[PDB]
Copies of this chain bind each other. A is one copy, B any other.
């Protein structure tokens, strides 16, 4: 379903999820899992609201969402913390830092990775419109197959457009494109270490069963 890149960015602007509005050992585990669940509900809705997503296979829709909920959640946290150095804005109410993450053993390294990546995004001077395309691509590339390639190339065109609209040379444009794209490897990296810890906490019972993200964690 063909449309202009400017239009795709606007529908992605609208599709955006509402802001979820919410120290000891287990208290922060259930606060984070509470937020992750509430946010996941919004993600599925957000994902469905992406043009062409619901036209995709039932298998594909699930396999995609399954393989990136963690990353899309982290990318969201990265944008929330972009203009707050040394802080991770999980929710506008519940804000945490490096010296706050020391509560649980093993959870320190992930907060460091997230902050380091947020920093790299801050240095990059990442725009809102640039970010939206990035999040959608994170979801569509975390893998009908041809319909997906089309939907991805659409958000790729939508990102190439936002990068052109900033007003810079063909070299500085392409360089900036590749910059954020290679910075996504670092988001996925942090997402994997988070999944290895999340699945380990499920197999430790420090985090509750609760809802939805329990359904996500299994498959």
Contact = CB atoms under 8 A, between A and B. Distances in A.
Interface of A: 137, 141-143, 152-153, 156-157, 159-160, 163, 170-171, 173-175, 177-179, 181-182, 184-186, 188, 192
A159 B188 CA distance: 23
A174 B173 contact: yes
Contact of A156 (B160, B173, B178, B184): B178
Chain A: interface secondary structure?
Answer: helix
A210 to B, nearest CB: 21
A108 to B, nearest CB: 18
Identify the 3 closest CB pairs spanning chains A and B, nearest first: A160-B174, A181-B181, A156-B178
7 contacts: A137-B182, A142-B185, A152-B182, A157-B171, A178-B181, A185-B188, A188-B188
Contacts of A156: 175, 178-179, 182
Given A143-B186, A188-B188, 17 more contacts: A137-B182, A152-B182, A153-B175, A156-B175, A156-B182, A157-B175, A160-B171, A160-B174, A173-B174, A174-B177, A177-B178, A178-B178, A178-B181, A181-B181, A184-B185, A185-B185, A185-B188
A5 to B, nearest CB: 10
Nearest to A182: B141
Given A141-B185, A182-B137, A163 B174 contact: yes
Contact of A178 (B142, B159, B185): B159
A178 B134 CA distance: 11
Contacts of A185: 141-142, 184-185, 188
A171 B170 CA distance: 10
A178 B104 CA distance: 37
A197 to B, nearest CB: 15
A217 to B, nearest CB: 17
